[PDB]
Amino acid sequence: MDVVSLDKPFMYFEEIDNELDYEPESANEVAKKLPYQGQLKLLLGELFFLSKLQRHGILDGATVVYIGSAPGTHIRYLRDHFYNLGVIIKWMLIDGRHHDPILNGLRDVTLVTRFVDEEYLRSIKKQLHPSKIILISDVRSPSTADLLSNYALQNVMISILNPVASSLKWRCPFPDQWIKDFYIPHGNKMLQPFAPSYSAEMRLLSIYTGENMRLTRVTKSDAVNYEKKMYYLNKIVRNKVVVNFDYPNQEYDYFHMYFMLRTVYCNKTFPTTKAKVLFLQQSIFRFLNIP
């Protein structure tokens, strides 16, 4: 068994302290071990991001514009959690595909069947006005050309919508498929427990102060670094059994999940963080129909 003792898990990309040459043979390996793992992956990250905004007092009264939201099964859980906490939020879910019918019939959630373009962002900006906007993007076209195009659209989401905060899907193009340098919004690169086995994807979390928009250039050398740091995390770290983690499941991803869930606010009071987390996890798994 691959056992180890850890203080805390890597919460962000910059914390990863080692790298490994990527082995293309990893791509043939089992990418997922849990049913609805993709919904779980998104639920934990967005729960984490949104609880943070709540902590900063910027969630209550906002309209969350989630683009690339379908099917969005896990969004129903997120919606219930804050709604039950008393936070007032309006949800605007836009995608060209159809959403899970569990999202229907809620006065606080508007579902829109539209693939967004810059022109549309403008009309929704005019229509949402003057509400404060929190952007969550998970759009998907893939080629580096597809990626660049997605990232370019995500930056236009921010410039037109002018949100108070944002969570953007982020995976650096692979160096062996580099095309050209580009810019992405400055933010914290949140690492995702339950991501596919060899995924190099993370979520870029940003909070916009003032009327400024800070960007950061991404080069091929950055791409090489992303690849190696993520490969190390995937191949070595995520394969660890944190034996000093006294919890029903000691696998790295559960240890990592624990740290995200501990930042989540509940109505029910617990004697320990362990008890809150076990509760949130149970609740989450029951909702997604995960054993």
Segment interacting with ligand SAH (CB under 6 A) among 72-80, 248-256, 261-269, 272-280: 72-80
Buried b (16+ CB within 10 A) or exposed e, 109-129: bebbeeebeeeebeebeeeee
- Alpha-carbon distance of 58 to 56, in angstroms, equals 6
Burial profile 38-58: b = 16 or more Cβ within 10 angstroms, e = fewer: bbbbbbbbbbbbbbbbbeeeb
Of a second copy, ligand SAH, ligand 1MC, none, which one sits near residue 216, judging by CB under 5 to 8 A according to partner kind? Answer: a second copy
d(CA 85, CA 51) in angstroms, rounded, equals: 11
Q: Which is nearer to ligand SAH, 74 or 256 (CB)?
A: 74
Return the number of the residue (25 or 119) whose C-beta is nearest a second copy: 119
275 contacts which partner out of ligand SAH, a second copy, ligand 1MC, none, CB within 5 to 8 A by kind? none
φ, ψ at 8 (rounded to 5°): -140, 165
Is the Cβ of residue 68 or residue 173 nearer to ligand SAH in the bound state? 68
Contact 95, 68 (CB under 8 A): yes
Active-site pick, 41, 52, 169, 189 = 169
Report the residue numbers after which the chain has a gap, meaning the C atom sits over 2.5 angstroms from the next written residue's N, or none: 141
Which partner in ligand 1MC, ligand SAH, a second copy, none is near 22 (CB below 5 to 8 A by kind)? ligand 1MC
Return the active site residues: 169
Residues near ligand SAH, by CB under 6 A? 42, 67-72, 74-75, 94-97, 115-116, 138-140
Annotated binding residues for mRNA, written as ranges, equal 22, 171-174, 176, 199-201, 227
